[PDB]
Amino acid sequence: PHMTELLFNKRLQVLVKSKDTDERRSVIRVSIELQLPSSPVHRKDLVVRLTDDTDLYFLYNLIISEEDFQSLKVQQGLLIDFTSFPQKFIDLLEQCICEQDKENPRFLLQLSSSSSAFDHSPSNLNIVETNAFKHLTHLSLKLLPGSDTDIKKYLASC
């Protein structure tokens, strides 16, 4: 059946932006869980969910299976394996938290769609290190906007 372990649940400052809007700084709830996988031969899936305490219409989520992580690892050149990924992801988020209330945060969290804010499309969750020369992306995740089923299901657990 569907069981989950909660690894991380915090509200973070997030720079939300689309290909047409301006960078809005919002307080977003970032939830990270491990769930039993579809297949007994796989490790637990990582579940990332973003919500807004002031907007029940706002929902983004992503399920990262062991296999999904392999593609991620290759595409971004990650040097760890799936087993340590959740903690490293969390460690990065904690650095964003440590820096969020500073004049010029060295680390910040972005939610950026390459499309219009008017579009029901994927948004990239980016953990970015700020630099005078050029910003460095430590991790990029492709989050999907919640479907009608996902939102109903989520709200039904609230």
**Resolution in angstrom units:** 1.9
Q: CA 6, CA 33: separation in Å to the nearest integer?
A: 4
- Within the chain, how many helices (H) and strands (E) appear? 3, 7
Domain ranges of the chain: 1-158
Q: What 3-state DSSP class applies to 153?
A: helix
**Strand partners for 123:** 143
Strands (E), 96-153: 107-112, 123-129, 136-145
Return the closest-CA partner of residue 89 out of 102, 104, 73. 73
What letter does residue 84 receive in the DSSP assignment?
G
Strands (E), 18-88: 24-35, 45-52, 55-64
Phi-psi region of 77 (alpha: psi -120 to 50; beta: other; left: phi over 0): left
Q: Which CATH superfamily is domain 1-158 in?
A: Spindle assembly abnormal protein 6, N-terminal domain (2.170.210.20)
The separation between the first and the last C-alpha atoms of the chain, rounded to the nearest angstrom, is 20
Q: CA 17, CA 24: separation in Å to the nearest integer?
A: 6
